[PDB]
Design a protein around this ligand. Structure first.
Ligand SMILES: [Zn+2]
Lengths: 143, 61, 36, 149, 129
RNA sequence: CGCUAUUAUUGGGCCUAAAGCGUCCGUAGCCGGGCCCGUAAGUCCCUGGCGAAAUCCCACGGCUCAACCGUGGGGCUUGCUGGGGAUACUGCGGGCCUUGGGACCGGGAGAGGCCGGGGGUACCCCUGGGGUAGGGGUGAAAUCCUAUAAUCCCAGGGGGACCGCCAGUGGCGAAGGCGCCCGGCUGGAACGGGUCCGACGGUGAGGGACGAAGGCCAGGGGAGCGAACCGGAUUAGAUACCCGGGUAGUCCUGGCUGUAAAGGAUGCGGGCUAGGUGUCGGGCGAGCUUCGAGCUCGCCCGGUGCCGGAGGGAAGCCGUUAAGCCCGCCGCC
RNA sequence: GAGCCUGGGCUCCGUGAGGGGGGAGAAGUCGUAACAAGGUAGCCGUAGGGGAACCUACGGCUCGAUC
């Protein structure tokens, strides 16, 4: 019926009600209990560095048909292995094994997979301290 | 004007006993047997609702 | 158990009663294997 | 009667707004009390006293012909009840019910009535403690209450 | 059960006005109700209220004239100072001088304009417009 | 952070989309009827002592204006404290009231519950008499009963469960749920009431009591039905639907388990916002009468249904038995 | 009263023969359980059974069509 508690001296029951039903929204739970910082391989960072081990291709989801070029990357902070997508037309040829490469988020809902390649959360930005955009446009070279 | 103040539907009665000629005031919705205070006969016998008067009604207050 | 009636609706699903029968069998196997 | 069954019943009394006794009453305030005491010593209760006075002797609203009520009239004399009437009646009902439930164990629908009667009892006990018509630690026990009726 | 008769009275008024009635009967009477009706009469929202006497309590008989849009009781009865009236105005009324907040002060029940002129605060109990 | 009235005091929602505990009784706590007297704790006004500076707002002035700096006036410092004054509201203290609730009397209603006794048909088995070849069963058939005389008819004996039509859109009960008759014990509701007490009330975290079927423990009993099981068919196959048999179980005593589409898929109390027409109980008033605890018509109260106007809603639909406007408490998303 | 050793409690992490189920993924095998009376109406609860969807029994609900 009418909303409770609405009295004038019912001050702490209202606080309790709020504090109880505010554990149902993930936005508060995952921020107070620090779950992302716990399961994150980047240790709470925007960027990270690693070394390349394997160059591979992934299938695009339906109803699209394409191979997306990616690489496995073993991080240097913690040693965890992740996967990163190489953007641009021919960006995979400017890369090789044992090259150091810098890793960003790919851009997606809830800091997550973007578009038609799920399973990939990260993106390559720099190769041996040079930028992929330049290496792909033809303005700089990889040392 | 409207039916705002509830008024009782029961009335007090002044009756006369047909045996001894005694006169007495009684209630018209009794929950107990009503008897004459002189000879002890029955004047009103109780029911669920209005009582059945076994006497002569002189007046209705 | 807690039951959500949403699950009784049979579109895209097998029947809920049979899923409930499957869940208890798995629970009995797991519980026996530990040795309780 | 709403306390447990939750029904909206209306079968009460409709008194008129009177401020003084009518003029057709025969008896007077000094005989009304004598009749009250006579009926009490005959053995009736307050409600039955009032009912009889209304039906036979034609006396409405004793508190009009007298500025005081029946229980005051009795406590002035030596005829006041120590345990009030409501509580007493409820305790009698409960005692008889226990007597019968000891021999009909599996009735199981009258035990609930017993529980409800006891709830009523405890409500009234908590009321009367504050006002002082029972000591501040009076309790209800069936075995001790057998010895009140 | 019955907690507040003032709210019942005011809601009965709103409903009867909304549906187009002439007279309104308020069974459980009080003195707050009389004072509120007095303020409403002085400000011109009703006409010709009278008190009828039965043995239980009072009854109030009121005439309506068609100058009410809304009316209700403020719960909880908030305390208010002589410096924070525009807040509750903006909260309960639609324009800057449109309707009346009814306040209970240590000098009696009054409108917030009178209370502000006198330089006092109090507790909030009702609003009308 | 905002967008987000997707955390909702302002300001959300729970018939069908996420969401009412299975239902009741009650502890703390929150909310609490009307008048009178008092106090002045909360609340309101006036004033004294404190809440560093920088930071924030405004005007003026100095570095070209500005950003910046300076003089002054205000706020911020979620407030603490010393006094004076007021008494509408709340709290505390003391008296009064009867409208809410409770107690009592009366005549009635009802498958409410427990105990004891007496019965009604039907079904199954057995024994006797009669009679000769098929009976049952299906979409069609076969497994099965039958010449050691079946099905069918008659006379007797025994046993276990159930209480048909009347029976209702009906009634009682917190819900689960409750239908043969007579007798005893017992719970609750409505009506009528110038009867008694005198606010004794609402909801209820935690806690408790009841709670279909099925299942378990211990003891008895065992007609019909019948999970499992076994057989015959149907089928590409048929671990099934159909047929013939059958164990636990269904029943009584004494205990555990505590679940369901436990559904009005609609939490409980209180006041308000058009009515109409049926039915159940009680009461009142008129007319009929075969003088019947009888028939018909109208009114008040309470229960239970069908329509429906304003009004509400995403709509279906609800609509004084709200899913509408108000005053409250608890559970949940 | 440090450090060292010893026992206990709480707690975090890594690993392990073998096994368990979950989620995705072009195209595979066996069936055809649900939506129409979906070809035995569907679904809740309890219990037993089956390669698998599933089938039966007791009590319930209509969110069930035809007369
Ligand atoms: Zn006589």
């Amino acid at each position: 019926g009418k909303k409770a508690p609405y009295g004038e001296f019912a001050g702490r029951k209202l606080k309790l009600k709020r504090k109880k039903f505010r554990w149902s929204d993930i936005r508060y739970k995952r921020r107070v209990l620090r779950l992302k910082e716990k399961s994150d391989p980047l240790e709470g960072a925007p960027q990270a560095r690693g070394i390349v081990l394997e160059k591979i291709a992934v299938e695009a989801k339906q109803p699209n048909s394409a191979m997306r070029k990616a690489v496995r990357v073993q991080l240097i902070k913690n040693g965890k292995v992740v996967t990163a997508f190489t953007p641009g037309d021919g960006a995979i040829n400017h890369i090789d094994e044992h090259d150091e490469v810098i890793i960003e988020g790919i851009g997606g809902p809830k800091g997550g997979s973007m578009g038609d390649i799920p399973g990939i959360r990260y993106k390559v930005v720099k190769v041996n301290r040079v930028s992929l955009k330049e290496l792909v446009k033809g303005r700089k070279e990889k040392p | 004007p409207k039916n705002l103040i509830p008024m009782p539907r029961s009335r007090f009665l002044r009756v006369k006993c047909i045996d001894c000629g005694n006169e007495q005031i009684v209630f018209s919705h009794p929950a107990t047997p009503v008897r004459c205070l002189v000879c002890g006969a029955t004047l009103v016998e109780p029911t669920g609702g209005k009582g059945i008067i076994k006497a002569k009604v002189l007046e209705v207050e | 158990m807690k039951r959500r009636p949403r699950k009784w609706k049979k579109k895209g699903r097998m029947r809920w009663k049979w899923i409930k029968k499957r869940i208890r069998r798995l629970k009995r196997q797991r519980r026996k294997e530990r040795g309780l | 009667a709403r306390i447990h069954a939750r029904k909206r019943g209306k079968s009460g009394s409709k008194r008129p707004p009177r401020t003084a006794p009518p003029a057709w009453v025969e008896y007077t305030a000094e005989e009304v009390e004598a009749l009250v005491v006579k009926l009490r010593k005959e053995g009736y209760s307050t409600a039955m006293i009032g009912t009889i006075l209304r039906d036979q002797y034609g006396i409405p609203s004793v508190k009009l012909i007298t500025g005081k009520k029946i229980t005051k009239i009795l406590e002035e004399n030596g005829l006041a009840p120590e345990i009030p009437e409501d509580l007493m009646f409820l305790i009698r009902r409960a005692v008889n019910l226990r007597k019968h439930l000891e021999q009909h164990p599996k009735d199981k629908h009258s035990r609930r009535g017993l529980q409800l009667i006891e709830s009523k009892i405890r409500r009234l006990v908590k009321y009367y403690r504050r006002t002082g018509k029972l000591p501040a630690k009076w309790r209800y026990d069936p075995e001790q209450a057998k010895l009140l009726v | 059960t019955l907690l507040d008769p003032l709210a019942n009275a005011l809601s009965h008024i709103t409903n009867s006005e909304r549906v187009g009635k002439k007279e309104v009967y308020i069974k459980p009477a009080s003195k707050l109700i009389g004072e509120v009706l007095r303020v409403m009469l002085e400000n011109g929202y009703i006409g010709e209220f009278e008190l009828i006497d039965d043995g239980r309590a009072g009854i109030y008989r009121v005439q309506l004239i068609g100058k009410i849009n809304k009316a209700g009781a403020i719960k909880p009865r908030f305390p208010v100072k002589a410096r924070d009236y525009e807040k509750w105005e903006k909260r309960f009324l639609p324009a800057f001088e449109f309707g009346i907040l009814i306040v209970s002060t240590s000098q009696g029940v009054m409108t917030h304009k009178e209370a502000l002129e006198k330089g006092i605060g109090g507790r909030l109990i009702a609003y009308v417009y």
